[PDB]
Amino acid sequence: PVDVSVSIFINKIYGVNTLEQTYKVDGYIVAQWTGKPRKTPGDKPLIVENTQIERWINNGLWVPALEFINVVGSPDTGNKRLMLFPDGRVIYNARFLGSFSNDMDFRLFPFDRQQFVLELEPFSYNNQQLRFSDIQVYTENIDNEEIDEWWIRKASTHISDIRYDHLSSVQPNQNEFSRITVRIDAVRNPSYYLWSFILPLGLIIAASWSVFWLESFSERLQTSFTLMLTVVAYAFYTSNILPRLPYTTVIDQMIIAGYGSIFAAILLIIFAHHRQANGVEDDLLIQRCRLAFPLGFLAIGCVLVI
Amino acid sequence: PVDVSVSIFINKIYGVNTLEQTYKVDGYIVAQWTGKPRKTPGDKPLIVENTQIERWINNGLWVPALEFINVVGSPDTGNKRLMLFPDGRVIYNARFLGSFSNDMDFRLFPFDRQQFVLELEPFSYNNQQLRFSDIQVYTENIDNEEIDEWWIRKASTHISDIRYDHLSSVQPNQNEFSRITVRIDAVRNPSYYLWSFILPLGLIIAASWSVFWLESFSERLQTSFTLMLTVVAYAFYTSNILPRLPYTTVIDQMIIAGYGSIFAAILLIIFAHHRQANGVEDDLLIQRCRLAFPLGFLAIGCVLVI
Amino acid sequence: PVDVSVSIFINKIYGVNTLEQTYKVDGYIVAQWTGKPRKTPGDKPLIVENTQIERWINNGLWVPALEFINVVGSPDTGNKRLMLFPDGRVIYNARFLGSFSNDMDFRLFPFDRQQFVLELEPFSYNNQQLRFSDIQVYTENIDNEEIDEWWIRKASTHISDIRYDHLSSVQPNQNEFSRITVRIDAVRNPSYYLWSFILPLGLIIAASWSVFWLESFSERLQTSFTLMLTVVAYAFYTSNILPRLPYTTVIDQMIIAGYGSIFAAILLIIFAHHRQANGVEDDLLIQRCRLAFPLGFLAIGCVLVI
Amino acid sequence: PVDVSVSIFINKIYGVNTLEQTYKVDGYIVAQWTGKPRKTPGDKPLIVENTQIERWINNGLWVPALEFINVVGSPDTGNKRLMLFPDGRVIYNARFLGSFSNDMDFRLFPFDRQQFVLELEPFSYNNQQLRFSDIQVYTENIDNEEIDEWWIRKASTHISDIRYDHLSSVQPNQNEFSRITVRIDAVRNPSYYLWSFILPLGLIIAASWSVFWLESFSERLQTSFTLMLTVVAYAFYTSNILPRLPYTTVIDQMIIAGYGSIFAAILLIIFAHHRQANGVEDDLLIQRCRLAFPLGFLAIGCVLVI
Amino acid sequence: PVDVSVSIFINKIYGVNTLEQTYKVDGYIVAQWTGKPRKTPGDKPLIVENTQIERWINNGLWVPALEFINVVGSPDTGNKRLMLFPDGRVIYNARFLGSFSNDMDFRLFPFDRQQFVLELEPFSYNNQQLRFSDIQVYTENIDNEEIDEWWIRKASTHISDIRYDHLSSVQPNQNEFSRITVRIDAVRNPSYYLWSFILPLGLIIAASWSVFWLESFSERLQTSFTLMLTVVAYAFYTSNILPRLPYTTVIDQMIIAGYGSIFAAILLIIFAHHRQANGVEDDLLIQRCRLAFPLGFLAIGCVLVI
């Protein structure tokens, strides 16, 4: 059972694709294992770079194929490099950039709690064990954060053994590969979305109610039609700029709320009026519920928070 | 007639392209067949990974080219791997990611019933038969359904024989290739579309009718012009966010319905008024059909459901 | 003069790029010619697949480079395959997916009459003649037409000789290559565009005129300003969803028509009023041309159909 | 000093990228030079195609690397081809598709005057001279210019010598390479933009002024608020469909003009009214400058043309 | 410790990707170092172009792999070239085009102060020192600037030594690589954004206040609802055209300011009216604060500039 020591260097985690639950990662992988000591020119460990590595494979030198279990597609390999030591051991170092997949829940969108994961695992070796895994999240925990879309926490390893129940034509016990699973926790930078989406959306819902502080009945009604046209014009601005998903976020709901608030008003207003014993018998208290559902909406809003 | 045993591992089905009737699939293919027993180093199965496989071909080792009949373009191959057994048999294992095509009907859009299909078939071998086909939809059913856009059911195999009537200059009986056809059934996650499209679109059509509970004639009419401007502003929000198709979905129709509901109102309102024995002889019952077509629209709507 | 027999199999024609006059085609090419009889292992045709073909070229085996004259870029080659017969003849079979160019006129957009073309031609062989050309448009002439964006007709061949008035430093007669030209006729699926664009655009132009059935002068005018704002909001919805072109389509014109219809109204209304012998002397007939240009627009529309 | 004769065949110039000042070009390059006479199988020139050319290089055959000085990225090479004559001379022919750069000024956007340029030049040869350059703009000048986005003129060559002041540690005179510079002049197809942007934008600015032919003060003002909302809704439609640039085009200004015209009106109207010696003494002449700045805008417009 | 002399030729810096903090750079790299004198066919330096270089490596010729530390992905290499001198020294020259990363702050968007950086560094050589670094920003310092999106300054070198605290299994002193760091300073071209965004946005905020110069109460209020609908329609036009970021720019704030200015007005107006001692006791001074916050907004604006 060959002992391999992996070292992942995260360089940048960017491009989150909300719909496909994808995110790009740029960094280097370093794998080290020991082989039958070798005679290296001069003596100081040998250095085989790009084109060359493929040659040394053709001459016997084995190099384990470490697949990235959760990569959509196939990584963009930069510089590959083999460092061969006289005492045997071999060190594989290569830079990569690939799109990884992972279950991502964007339900509370404006305020996300996501976790970026990597998953290394020998592509075709049952007993070729991954020794110790180390990740260098050489990123700035509290240096830059509000210049970047996401805020992090700290690296997180975890080696384990995966069992496939239908591998190759084997019975002895060939179905357990060791998988390195790295985890980086991150939280979304709310700022932008609050000050450009949540806030103004609130002032619209607020100023929505001020349709009651209108005297006439025609004014009280016809104005909610320009108010209706406003929430649509907003849901539009919201959708065209926000990340598409298969479910509704918090903002997606405030938009529905605004739609109900205005439809509610439409009913009351077209009720207070025609709930008359003469015609203009606008129920003085109902037509004046100017503080009834404006706060009765903090009751409908604190139920969406339950 | 060589016997091949295929095993398809579906890893992720994503990126549905409504217009091109395309969808991406990531997974591995495993093909097994038996050859003339071989002398393998040591004696345990041999493993040829990437660069190497191409070399063994140049030394006679035959490896059947299994084409993906319905793939738009040419798959993104990840790690290839040949496992050669001493007793002969060879096992081909490779990871792939490709865009597949298939007839897809998105007529009832908000509520889709689609089926993702794969079609393997030897690219150039008449009598090289596909033995048994197995598919591991190791996706998690009633697990993350509401975090993902599509909900599934269960795998579905089916080997068969395809006959081409104009092959290479051959007449004997060389025109029948065995094709593996895999099928995965899925249903779309309605949620988002209902609560952000169907609903508000309904409240707009509803509040649309409340143009009758207006006293004056000018109000009854000029208000449907801001109502007209609203349905357009909505069809806009809908189109910019929905998947483009060559035909109309359900929602595309609710939008047409709202256009007619408002044009209908325009006619009645500009009829009730000028259908006078004086000037302002608004047919008191017609001007008050405030419950005539609002429910007479549940008759026009239950005919689109006929 | 070598005799080659080509056979093109159209698998899918998709992705029409209106601006670049481009469209993607997936399928296989099959070329057959006869060479000096050969000794094939066993005796049955010798099947050489991918990696291998390039090798047989290095050992003399000639394989004519058949260029796709009208391909933007360079095709995506799938599986190549050489079938060598003992009696000499060689059969080349490969799958391709490429973007082809062709003059495309989208003037009558909603209702297009386009034709997808392919053009094969030896890249470097004057006297290497293309014998007979066959195309298998193995599609459903009338099976699923309303699920797909385009409707077709039937294949269409045509071999010919192209003369380049300036090729190599040759002139005896080396300037005539045989070019296979395939043609597939198709018509656009109007549906969607009619029911989501033409129709509602008409009801907007219609309801546009109902600005005359308004009593007051301020109403008659100020309402066309919300009507003006409507046509713009529509031209917007139209452009964002329609295919960009360098010229105007039919729909691009109905939008111009609506802009004139509303500007026309603006003039009449601000004329009828200030065209008085007292003040509100709205020429009792002009202010009531409620049926003057509404049908006088079917005269302006039947002149755009001239 | 080797004499090379180049021949560029322009096949299609498309995809202009306004922001990066990029445009795609598809065509073939043909380079001819003479070498030490050779023994060609048979005797008629020898034809070397794709894979093979790289082989002949490995056997001494030199082939000059001709770089495309102004190409963003690295061309998409189609079919390469070497034609070797017995009398020595060699003819290189290959098809290419690349994205070229060049200074492009889109200030007068609707009416552009651009020029597409190519620049060939030996990548590493000081005295390897480019003899005569010929370009076949076998595109069709007066063909269907109203189908294509750009209209052309005629080819344009120009060989020259470029001097680099920072080369290898060479002193004698190694710093002058011959560069072929091809130029194709083109003008944009105004049509679409005039009839879908310039025109309606004008009718909006026109009908903008008709805010003065309103009686009341509130009408005169409140209407310019729906007029304001209209210019914004238009600047939106314009931006979303027009090519993004770092500067303003003609249309970008008409939009600014419409913004000033409406802000001007806002001032006058809120001046005429409150510029009194009573309360409603709207300066009968100012409130009636209905022809003051409407033509005084053809003065503001003929100064933007000044 | 090998002495290498690098020379970077910037050809074009384009395509800034605000969200990923990416930008594309096209140019050439030239590296020179001296080796054991060689016998060059003839005597003048020897030139190995593309395909060939990889060959000379297979025959011992070492060529140091110089990685681009901050490149997202892997550069697009154009023409490679090795110039071997008889006196030993070797000159590597290759053209590249790649996407580079760097911390970019776009807080003051309309007016950016960015700096494009390159970072070369031997991929696997501890003592292979970078001698002197030179950069040719052969661009037009003033020549053209309002034709291009960015304005520059002057090149900027800086060689240094980077220490990795845990590289290979090497304890001696192998952890210091010499890194060339190039810096180019640039400022964004404000023009377009000022005249198409800042300005009209101001005129909207200005004309926003003129809602006070309205007589009635219903007018004063209902007009701010068409004013509200305007700011939204503007925030939309702004977002769809501006570069997406995780934080708010200057413009993102003017939009918030307009939202508050309008919500402020809504409060005052629905205060002046109902803050009575009868009914219409519109605090003649408050209802006439027509110059209160219009300039009291230059106080709220000069606090955002605090």
mmCIF file with all atom_site columns, C-alpha atoms in Angstrom, chain C residues 181-294:
data_model
loop_
_atom_site.group_PDB
_atom_site.id
_atom_site.type_symbol
_atom_site.label_atom_id
_atom_site.label_alt_id
_atom_site.label_comp_id
_atom_site.label_asym_id
_atom_site.label_entity_id
_atom_site.label_seq_id
_atom_site.pdbx_PDB_ins_code
_atom_site.Cartn_x
_atom_site.Cartn_y
_atom_site.Cartn_z
_atom_site.occupancy
_atom_site.B_iso_or_equiv
_atom_site.pdbx_formal_charge
_atom_site.auth_seq_id
_atom_site.auth_comp_id
_atom_site.auth_asym_id
_atom_site.auth_atom_id
_atom_site.pdbx_PDB_model_num
ATOM 1   C CA . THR C 1 181 ? -22.697 21.370 -52.694 1.00 0.00 ? 181 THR C CA 1
ATOM 2   C CA . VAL C 1 182 ? -25.500 20.134 -50.447 1.00 0.00 ? 182 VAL C CA 1
ATOM 3   C CA . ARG C 1 183 ? -28.694 22.115 -49.807 1.00 0.00 ? 183 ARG C CA 1
ATOM 4   C CA . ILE C 1 184 ? -31.439 21.704 -47.201 1.00 0.00 ? 184 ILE C CA 1
ATOM 5   C CA . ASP C 1 185 ? -34.457 24.014 -47.323 1.00 0.00 ? 185 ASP C CA 1
ATOM 6   C CA . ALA C 1 186 ? -36.164 25.162 -44.150 1.00 0.00 ? 186 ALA C CA 1
ATOM 7   C CA . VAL C 1 187 ? -38.965 27.438 -42.986 1.00 0.00 ? 187 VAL C CA 1
ATOM 8   C CA . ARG C 1 188 ? -39.182 29.102 -39.565 1.00 0.00 ? 188 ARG C CA 1
ATOM 9   C CA . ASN C 1 189 ? -41.841 28.081 -37.022 1.00 0.00 ? 189 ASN C CA 1
ATOM 10  C CA . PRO C 1 190 ? -43.963 31.308 -36.822 1.00 0.00 ? 190 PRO C CA 1
ATOM 11  C CA . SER C 1 191 ? -46.130 30.239 -33.858 1.00 0.00 ? 191 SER C CA 1
ATOM 12  C CA . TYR C 1 192 ? -44.347 31.755 -30.838 1.00 0.00 ? 192 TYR C CA 1
ATOM 13  C CA . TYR C 1 193 ? -43.630 35.054 -32.593 1.00 0.00 ? 193 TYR C CA 1
ATOM 14  C CA . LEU C 1 194 ? -47.237 35.468 -33.752 1.00 0.00 ? 194 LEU C CA 1
ATOM 15  C CA . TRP C 1 195 ? -48.903 34.771 -30.439 1.00 0.00 ? 195 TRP C CA 1
ATOM 16  C CA . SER C 1 196 ? -46.372 36.608 -28.291 1.00 0.00 ? 196 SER C CA 1
ATOM 17  C CA . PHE C 1 197 ? -45.299 39.446 -30.557 1.00 0.00 ? 197 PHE C CA 1
ATOM 18  C CA . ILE C 1 198 ? -47.452 40.166 -33.619 1.00 0.00 ? 198 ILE C CA 1
ATOM 19  C CA . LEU C 1 199 ? -50.802 39.801 -31.849 1.00 0.00 ? 199 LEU C CA 1
ATOM 20  C CA . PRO C 1 200 ? -50.262 41.836 -28.658 1.00 0.00 ? 200 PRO C CA 1
ATOM 21  C CA . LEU C 1 201 ? -48.424 44.420 -30.747 1.00 0.00 ? 201 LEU C CA 1
ATOM 22  C CA . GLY C 1 202 ? -51.618 44.718 -32.769 1.00 0.00 ? 202 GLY C CA 1
ATOM 23  C CA . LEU C 1 203 ? -53.925 45.069 -29.783 1.00 0.00 ? 203 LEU C CA 1
ATOM 24  C CA . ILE C 1 204 ? -51.586 47.847 -28.605 1.00 0.00 ? 204 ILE C CA 1
ATOM 25  C CA . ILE C 1 205 ? -51.927 49.652 -31.936 1.00 0.00 ? 205 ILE C CA 1
ATOM 26  C CA . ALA C 1 206 ? -55.681 48.997 -31.862 1.00 0.00 ? 206 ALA C CA 1
ATOM 27  C CA . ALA C 1 207 ? -56.314 50.163 -28.309 1.00 0.00 ? 207 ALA C CA 1
ATOM 28  C CA . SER C 1 208 ? -53.987 52.992 -29.353 1.00 0.00 ? 208 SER C CA 1
ATOM 29  C CA . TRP C 1 209 ? -56.760 54.561 -31.398 1.00 0.00 ? 209 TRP C CA 1
ATOM 30  C CA . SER C 1 210 ? -59.339 54.347 -28.599 1.00 0.00 ? 210 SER C CA 1
ATOM 31  C CA . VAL C 1 211 ? -57.682 57.573 -27.385 1.00 0.00 ? 211 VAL C CA 1
ATOM 32  C CA . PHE C 1 212 ? -60.283 59.354 -29.499 1.00 0.00 ? 212 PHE C CA 1
ATOM 33  C CA . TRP C 1 213 ? -63.285 57.995 -27.597 1.00 0.00 ? 213 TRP C CA 1
ATOM 34  C CA . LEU C 1 214 ? -62.174 60.283 -24.762 1.00 0.00 ? 214 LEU C CA 1
ATOM 35  C CA . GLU C 1 215 ? -64.254 63.387 -24.068 1.00 0.00 ? 215 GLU C CA 1
ATOM 36  C CA . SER C 1 216 ? -61.882 66.114 -22.816 1.00 0.00 ? 216 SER C CA 1
ATOM 37  C CA . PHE C 1 217 ? -58.880 67.499 -24.716 1.00 0.00 ? 217 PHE C CA 1
ATOM 38  C CA . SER C 1 218 ? -56.371 66.980 -21.918 1.00 0.00 ? 218 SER C CA 1
ATOM 39  C CA . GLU C 1 219 ? -57.511 63.366 -21.599 1.00 0.00 ? 219 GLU C CA 1
ATOM 40  C CA . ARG C 1 220 ? -57.278 62.807 -25.364 1.00 0.00 ? 220 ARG C CA 1
ATOM 41  C CA . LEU C 1 221 ? -53.680 64.114 -25.292 1.00 0.00 ? 221 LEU C CA 1
ATOM 42  C CA . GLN C 1 222 ? -52.178 63.100 -21.924 1.00 0.00 ? 222 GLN C CA 1
ATOM 43  C CA . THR C 1 223 ? -53.365 59.543 -22.582 1.00 0.00 ? 223 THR C CA 1
ATOM 44  C CA . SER C 1 224 ? -51.315 59.234 -25.767 1.00 0.00 ? 224 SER C CA 1
ATOM 45  C CA . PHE C 1 225 ? -48.269 60.046 -23.611 1.00 0.00 ? 225 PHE C CA 1
ATOM 46  C CA . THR C 1 226 ? -48.883 56.907 -21.584 1.00 0.00 ? 226 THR C CA 1
ATOM 47  C CA . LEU C 1 227 ? -49.543 55.282 -24.947 1.00 0.00 ? 227 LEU C CA 1
ATOM 48  C CA . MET C 1 228 ? -46.207 56.557 -26.258 1.00 0.00 ? 228 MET C CA 1
ATOM 49  C CA . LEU C 1 229 ? -44.482 55.210 -23.140 1.00 0.00 ? 229 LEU C CA 1
ATOM 50  C CA . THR C 1 230 ? -46.199 51.899 -23.947 1.00 0.00 ? 230 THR C CA 1
ATOM 51  C CA . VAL C 1 231 ? -44.850 51.490 -27.477 1.00 0.00 ? 231 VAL C CA 1
ATOM 52  C CA . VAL C 1 232 ? -41.343 52.199 -26.194 1.00 0.00 ? 232 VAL C CA 1
ATOM 53  C CA . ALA C 1 233 ? -41.784 49.676 -23.386 1.00 0.00 ? 233 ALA C CA 1
ATOM 54  C CA . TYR C 1 234 ? -42.824 47.251 -26.109 1.00 0.00 ? 234 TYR C CA 1
ATOM 55  C CA . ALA C 1 235 ? -40.041 48.000 -28.602 1.00 0.00 ? 235 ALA C CA 1
ATOM 56  C CA . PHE C 1 236 ? -37.797 47.226 -25.638 1.00 0.00 ? 236 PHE C CA 1
ATOM 57  C CA . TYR C 1 237 ? -39.433 43.862 -24.876 1.00 0.00 ? 237 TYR C CA 1
ATOM 58  C CA . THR C 1 238 ? -39.230 43.088 -28.592 1.00 0.00 ? 238 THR C CA 1
ATOM 59  C CA . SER C 1 239 ? -35.558 43.924 -29.121 1.00 0.00 ? 239 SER C CA 1
ATOM 60  C CA . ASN C 1 240 ? -34.255 42.225 -26.001 1.00 0.00 ? 240 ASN C CA 1
ATOM 61  C CA . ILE C 1 241 ? -35.909 38.966 -27.104 1.00 0.00 ? 241 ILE C CA 1
ATOM 62  C CA . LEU C 1 242 ? -35.582 39.094 -30.912 1.00 0.00 ? 242 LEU C CA 1
ATOM 63  C CA . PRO C 1 243 ? -32.475 38.245 -33.017 1.00 0.00 ? 243 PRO C CA 1
ATOM 64  C CA . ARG C 1 244 ? -30.278 41.274 -33.710 1.00 0.00 ? 244 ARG C CA 1
ATOM 65  C CA . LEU C 1 245 ? -29.857 42.158 -37.399 1.00 0.00 ? 245 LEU C CA 1
ATOM 66  C CA . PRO C 1 246 ? -28.475 45.045 -39.514 1.00 0.00 ? 246 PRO C CA 1
ATOM 67  C CA . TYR C 1 247 ? -31.910 45.706 -41.059 1.00 0.00 ? 247 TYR C CA 1
ATOM 68  C CA . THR C 1 248 ? -35.540 45.941 -39.946 1.00 0.00 ? 248 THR C CA 1
ATOM 69  C CA . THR C 1 249 ? -37.872 42.948 -39.951 1.00 0.00 ? 249 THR C CA 1
ATOM 70  C CA . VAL C 1 250 ? -41.659 42.977 -40.210 1.00 0.00 ? 250 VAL C CA 1
ATOM 71  C CA . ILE C 1 251 ? -42.034 43.360 -36.443 1.00 0.00 ? 251 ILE C CA 1
ATOM 72  C CA . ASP C 1 252 ? -39.438 46.141 -36.396 1.00 0.00 ? 252 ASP C CA 1
ATOM 73  C CA . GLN C 1 253 ? -41.840 48.010 -38.660 1.00 0.00 ? 253 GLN C CA 1
ATOM 74  C CA . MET C 1 254 ? -45.104 47.395 -36.793 1.00 0.00 ? 254 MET C CA 1
ATOM 75  C CA . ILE C 1 255 ? -43.232 49.090 -33.941 1.00 0.00 ? 255 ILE C CA 1
ATOM 76  C CA . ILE C 1 256 ? -42.460 52.057 -36.194 1.00 0.00 ? 256 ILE C CA 1
ATOM 77  C CA . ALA C 1 257 ? -46.086 52.055 -37.335 1.00 0.00 ? 257 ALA C CA 1
ATOM 78  C CA . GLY C 1 258 ? -47.255 52.266 -33.732 1.00 0.00 ? 258 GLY C CA 1
ATOM 79  C CA . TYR C 1 259 ? -44.874 55.190 -33.195 1.00 0.00 ? 259 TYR C CA 1
ATOM 80  C CA . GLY C 1 260 ? -46.399 57.034 -36.126 1.00 0.00 ? 260 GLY C CA 1
ATOM 81  C CA . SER C 1 261 ? -49.978 56.117 -35.250 1.00 0.00 ? 261 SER C CA 1
ATOM 82  C CA . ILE C 1 262 ? -49.432 57.708 -31.839 1.00 0.00 ? 262 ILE C CA 1
ATOM 83  C CA . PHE C 1 263 ? -47.553 60.712 -33.230 1.00 0.00 ? 263 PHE C CA 1
ATOM 84  C CA . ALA C 1 264 ? -50.345 61.140 -35.793 1.00 0.00 ? 264 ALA C CA 1
ATOM 85  C CA . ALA C 1 265 ? -52.933 61.153 -33.027 1.00 0.00 ? 265 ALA C CA 1
ATOM 86  C CA . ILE C 1 266 ? -50.809 63.673 -31.109 1.00 0.00 ? 266 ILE C CA 1
ATOM 87  C CA . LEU C 1 267 ? -50.999 66.073 -34.030 1.00 0.00 ? 267 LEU C CA 1
ATOM 88  C CA . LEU C 1 268 ? -54.731 65.673 -34.716 1.00 0.00 ? 268 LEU C CA 1
ATOM 89  C CA . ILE C 1 269 ? -55.639 66.014 -31.039 1.00 0.00 ? 269 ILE C CA 1
ATOM 90  C CA . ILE C 1 270 ? -53.452 69.118 -30.624 1.00 0.00 ? 270 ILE C CA 1
ATOM 91  C CA . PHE C 1 271 ? -55.025 70.369 -33.843 1.00 0.00 ? 271 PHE C CA 1
ATOM 92  C CA . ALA C 1 272 ? -58.719 69.618 -33.407 1.00 0.00 ? 272 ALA C CA 1
ATOM 93  C CA . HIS C 1 273 ? -58.554 71.636 -30.187 1.00 0.00 ? 273 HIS C CA 1
ATOM 94  C CA . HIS C 1 274 ? -56.554 74.677 -31.261 1.00 0.00 ? 274 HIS C CA 1
ATOM 95  C CA . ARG C 1 275 ? -58.302 74.673 -34.648 1.00 0.00 ? 275 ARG C CA 1
ATOM 96  C CA . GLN C 1 276 ? -61.229 76.736 -33.430 1.00 0.00 ? 276 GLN C CA 1
ATOM 97  C CA . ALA C 1 277 ? -63.498 79.692 -34.176 1.00 0.00 ? 277 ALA C CA 1
ATOM 98  C CA . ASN C 1 278 ? -63.989 80.012 -30.391 1.00 0.00 ? 278 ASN C CA 1
ATOM 99  C CA . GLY C 1 279 ? -61.778 77.634 -28.353 1.00 0.00 ? 279 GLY C CA 1
ATOM 100 C CA . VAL C 1 280 ? -63.159 74.120 -27.828 1.00 0.00 ? 280 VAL C CA 1
ATOM 101 C CA . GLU C 1 281 ? -64.267 74.092 -31.476 1.00 0.00 ? 281 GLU C CA 1
ATOM 102 C CA . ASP C 1 282 ? -62.944 70.578 -31.922 1.00 0.00 ? 282 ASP C CA 1
ATOM 103 C CA . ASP C 1 283 ? -64.206 70.114 -35.517 1.00 0.00 ? 283 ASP C CA 1
ATOM 104 C CA . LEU C 1 284 ? -67.021 67.785 -34.348 1.00 0.00 ? 284 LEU C CA 1
ATOM 105 C CA . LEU C 1 285 ? -65.870 65.343 -37.065 1.00 0.00 ? 285 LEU C CA 1
ATOM 106 C CA . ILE C 1 286 ? -62.064 65.397 -36.665 1.00 0.00 ? 286 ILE C CA 1
ATOM 107 C CA . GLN C 1 287 ? -62.208 64.797 -32.888 1.00 0.00 ? 287 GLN C CA 1
ATOM 108 C CA . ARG C 1 288 ? -64.528 62.006 -34.031 1.00 0.00 ? 288 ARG C CA 1
ATOM 109 C CA . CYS C 1 289 ? -62.309 60.419 -36.701 1.00 0.00 ? 289 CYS C CA 1
ATOM 110 C CA . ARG C 1 290 ? -62.488 57.476 -34.311 1.00 0.00 ? 290 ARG C CA 1
ATOM 111 C CA . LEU C 1 291 ? -62.937 55.360 -37.424 1.00 0.00 ? 291 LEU C CA 1
ATOM 112 C CA . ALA C 1 292 ? -60.990 57.605 -39.806 1.00 0.00 ? 292 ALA C CA 1
ATOM 113 C CA . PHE C 1 293 ? -57.417 56.384 -39.443 1.00 0.00 ? 293 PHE C CA 1
ATOM 114 C CA . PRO C 1 294 ? -58.164 53.233 -37.404 1.00 0.00 ? 294 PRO C CA 1
#
